[PDB]
């Protein structure tokens, strides 16, 4: 998952 | 309900949520919310190296209620979540364009  | 989001997905794969949005008429920034198998945000995107691809991120909750991606904005629905990215990518790969048919 993507962690902006 | 938020089963009456079209956007909304149930509780399906990663998998198949790649599946639902990489094929070739779904343009960059497709998106859809899906249940994690609390939500999780799956949105096509495109890169040189990569091409078209898809980035996922988990829509996290707060006891209190509101739920966030980043800590810099929090919301009180995943409707309002939906209607703030779709103006602004905000740090998202891209800006939420297209609801995943």
Known sequence: YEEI | ?101
């Open chain 2, 1 to 101: 309900s938020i089963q009456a989001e079209e956007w909304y997905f149930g509780k399906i794969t990663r998998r198949e949520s790649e599946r639902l949005l990489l094929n070739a008429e779904n343009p960059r920034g497709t998106f859809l919310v899906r249940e994690s198998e609390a939500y999780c945000l799956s949105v096509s995107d495109f890169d040189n190296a990569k091409g078209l691809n898809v980035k996922h991120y988990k829509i996290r909750k707060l006891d209190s209620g509101g739920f966030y991606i980043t800590s810099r904005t929090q919301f009180n629905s995943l409707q309002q979540l939906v209607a703030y990215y779709s103006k602004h990518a905000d740090g998202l790969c891209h800006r939420l364009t297209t609801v995943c048919p």
